[PDB]
C-alpha cells in the first residue's frame, strides 16, 4: 500500500522541473515518507502537508508567490500553532524536516507518528520550503521554512 507523490519545483510564474517523487507508506507507528529527489540545497528543509490540492502560484498584495494556492499547513484542529511532527498541539500537517544530502539528493526516510492513514493525505499537498524547521513559531514563524521551493498535490 502506497501513495506516489511527484514533486515539482515551484516558480512564481508557475510549475517548474520535476525533482523526483515521494513514496508514503503505513507502518505500525505512523506514515513513513521515503523521498527520492534531487537538485535541492544540502541541509534540512521545512517539509509539511498543506491544506489545498494545488501547487499553483498566486498573487499576494500584487506579488506572485510560488505555490501560494496551496493554502497553509493542514490543521483540522485550528490550533494555529506550528509545533512539529511530535507535538499533538500543533499543525497536523507538520512533518519532520526533509534531509537533503551533500549531492543535492533526498533519500533519508521520515516518520510522522501523528499521521496514521493514507486517507488523511487525500485532497492536500506536500511542501518543501527553502528554509529549515525548528518546529516552532519562534524566532521565525512556521518553523522558519520561508519560501516554497517544491510542491506536490496528493
**Binding site listing:** 48, 50, 73, 82, 91, 94, 129
Scanning 29-37, 60-68, 71-79, 137-145 for contacts with a second copy by CB under 8 A, the matching segment is 29-37
User: Residues 77-83: contacts with CB within 8 Å, 24+ apart?
Assistant: 81/137, 82/135, 82/136, 82/137, 82/141, 82/142, 82/143, 83/135, 83/136
Comparison of 9 and 94: residue with beta carbon closer to Zn ion? 94
Residues numbered 69 to 98 that lie near a second copy (CB under 8 A) are 85-88, 96-97
For 122, the grid coordinates are 487525500
Binding a second copy (rule: CB under 8 A), the pick from 37, 99, 106, 121 is 99
127 binds, among a second copy, Zn ion, Cu ion, none (CB under 5 to 8 A by kind): Cu ion
Amino acid at each position: 500500500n502506497t501513495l506516489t507523490v511527484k514533486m515539482n519545483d515551484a516558480l512564481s510564474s508557475g510549475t517548474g522541473e520535476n525533482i523526483g517523487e515521494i513514496t508514503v507508506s503505513e507502518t505500525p507507528y505512523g506514515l513513513l515518507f521515503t523521498p527520492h529527489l534531487n537538485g535541492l540545497t544540502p541541509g534540512i528543509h521545512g517539509f509539511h502537508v498543506h491544506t489545498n490540492p494545488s501547487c499553483m502560484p498566486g498573487m499576494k498584495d500584487g506579488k506572485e508567490v510560488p505555490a501560494l494556492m496551496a493554502g497553509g499547513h493542514l490543521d483540522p484542529e485550528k490550533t494555529g500553532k506550528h509545533l512539529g511532527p511530535y507535538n499533538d498541539k500543533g499543525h497536523l500537517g507538520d512533518l519532520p524536516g526533509l534531509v537533503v544530502n551533500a549531492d543535492g539528493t533526498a533519500t533519508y526516510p521520515l516518520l510522522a507518528p501523528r499521521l496514521k492513514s493514507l486517507s488523511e493525505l487525500k485532497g492536500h499537498s506536500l511542501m518543501i520550503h527553502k528554509g529549515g524547521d525548528n518546529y516552532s513559531d519562534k524566532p521565525a514563524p512556521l518553523g522558519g521554512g520561508g519560501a516554497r521551493f517544491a510542491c506536490g498535490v496528493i
